[PDB]
């Protein structure tokens, strides 16, 4: 955990659970918006991707 | 900080937000927006030029030193072929 | 996974997400009979001893 | 002289413990033959350590 | 791109679903009904608008 960064970049391979576990701020994003904890690709990807 | 108004008495707002503009403002959302803007902004030289110039000049001078030493070797050591120095 | 519809629960209309609106198994008001901790959010909940 | 720069790139840069001298690694001497030729990247010593580590890795193969 | 990823999630702001994302939760028998908001988009089988 100390040496890793989570990268959601696809509508697959973007599991909210892993990203929220690895970083604090993504977990804050998930807890403030629990409806985003879906897995059907509706989880917001960064605007770049 | 406060606002100075010509009318001393305010009006109660009526009708839809698509005919007169109004700055509605819960305090929590404004504080959250300001914090979010603060984090967003930060989340999105000449000394280097001096380093580059120093390294370029030193590379040139070092290439010169290597070439000078090599030429001195090719002269001095291979001059021994003819027994020039006794 | 069976509890709430993941096709339709993509959004919120209050503090609560739709998944909490559609099934009581999701919302923060139904507590389990046995608790080892207190829950993360207690917006409209007060606890009495 | 060369004492300063080699002491620097061993103990100051590489943070390598004092008991690891030039004698305990010939490959270390062959590498400082290269390292001191450039005076940059000394702020990120981790690069020098990773280079030395991977060099000693490749030097220790069986084939 | 990689290092910047956490900074997007630091902002507690949910994002709008795209029209294409919304179109995928209308079940087959009522994709043709008036309640299908996105229908004005669906002009062409091969193309998205």
């Amino acid at each position: 955990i100390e040496y890793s960064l989570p990268v959601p970049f696809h509508r697959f391979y973007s599991n909210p659970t892993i990203c929220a576990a690895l970083s604090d701020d993504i977990k804050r994003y998930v807890t403030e918006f629990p409806h985003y904890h879906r897995h059907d690709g509706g989880f917001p990807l960064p605007t770049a991707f | 900080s406060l606002l100075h108004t010509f009318w001393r008495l305010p009006v109660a707002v009526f009708f839809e937000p698509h005919e007169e503009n109004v700055l509605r403002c819960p305090e929590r959302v404004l504080r959250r927006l300001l914090e979010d803007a603060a984090v967003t902004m930060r989340g999105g030289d000449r000394v280097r030029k001096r380093y580059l110039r120093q390294e370029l000049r030193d590379l040139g001078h070092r290439v010169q030193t290597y070439c000078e030493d090599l030429e001195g070797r090719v002269s001095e050591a291979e001059a021994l072929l003819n027994q020039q120095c006794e | 996974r069976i509890s709430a519809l993941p096709g339709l629960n993509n959004g919120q209309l209050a503090e609560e997400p739709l998944s909490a609106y559609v099934n009581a198994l999701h919302d923060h008001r139904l507590w389990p009979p046995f608790v080892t901790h207190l829950p993360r959010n207690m917006e409209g909940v007060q606890v009495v001893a | 002289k060369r004492d300063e720069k080699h002491r620097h790139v061993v103990n100051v840069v590489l943070e390598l413990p004092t008991e690891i001298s030039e004698a305990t690694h010939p490959v270390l001497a062959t590498m400082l033959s290269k390292y001191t030729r450039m005076s940059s990247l000394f702020n990120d010593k981790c690069a020098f350590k990773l280079d030395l580590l991977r060099m000693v890795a490749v030097s220790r193969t069986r084939r | 791109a990689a290092r910047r990823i956490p900074h997007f999630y630091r902002v507690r702001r949910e994002v709008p679903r795209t029209v294409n994302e919304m179109k995928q939760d209308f079940v087959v028998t009522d994709f043709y009904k008036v309640g299908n908001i996105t229908l004005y988009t669906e002009l062409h089988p091969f193309f998205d608008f």
Side-chain angles (χ1 to χ4, degrees), chain C residues 6-38:
Chain C
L8 276 60
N9 70 6
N10 193 353
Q12 69 168 6
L13 65 90
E15 292 93 4
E16 288 90 339
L18 286 172
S19 50
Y21 272 112
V22 72
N23 193 329
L25 200 53
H26 282 279
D27 62 358
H28 70 260
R29 293 175 175 73
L30 177 51
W31 286 32
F34 300 78
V35 291
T36 56
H37 295 280
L38 287 189

Side-chain angles (χ1 to χ4, degrees), chain A:
Chain A
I1 295 164
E2 306 304 323
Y3 304 138
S4 54
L5 274 161
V7 178
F9 73 110
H10 204 286
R11 69 176 67 256
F12 321 125
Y13 310 116
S14 301
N15 183 359
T17 297
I18 304 184
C19 305
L22 297 187
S23 87
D24 167 51
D25 54 357
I26 296 178
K27 193 152 45 71
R28 304 320 298 283
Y29 195 90
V30 170
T31 61
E32 187 78 339
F33 302 122
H35 44 280
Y36 278 143
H37 200 249
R38 293 170 286 92
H39 294 234
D40 58 331
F43 178 68
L45 306 182
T47 309
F49 315 138

Side-chain angles (χ1 to χ4, degrees), chain D residues 16-47:
Chain D
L16 198 65
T18 313
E19 61 89 14
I20 310 186
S21 71
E22 312 297 325
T24 67
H25 272 26
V27 306
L28 198 44
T30 67
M31 283 310 307
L32 282 71
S33 69
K34 286 273 286 175
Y35 283 153
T36 60
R37 295 196 195 280
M38 59 88 69
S39 295
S40 292
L41 279 75
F42 277 136
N43 57 7
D44 73 306
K45 49 196 68 177
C46 49

Side-chain angles (χ1 to χ4, degrees), chain E residues 3-43:
Chain E
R3 66 189 307 273
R4 280 189 303 102
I5 289 160
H7 293 285
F8 167 79
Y9 291 99
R10 268 185 176 114
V11 191
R12 322 299 163 76
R13 293 285 295 205
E14 51 177 358
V15 285
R17 291 169 70 183
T18 75
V19 180
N20 182 263
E21 286 168 338
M22 290 189 181
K23 199 178 295 175
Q24 305 301 139
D25 62 33
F26 281 101
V27 295
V28 183
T29 185
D30 68 43
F31 195 83
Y32 306 121
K33 292 194 184 188
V34 176
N36 192 355
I37 307 165
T38 78
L39 267 180
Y40 69 93
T41 286
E42 200 56 30
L43 271 69

Side-chain angles (χ1 to χ4, degrees), chain D residues 10 21 39 55 59 62-63:
Chain D
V10 171
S21 71
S39 295
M55 174 47 59
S59 61
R62 197 182 68 141
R63 162 57 65 172

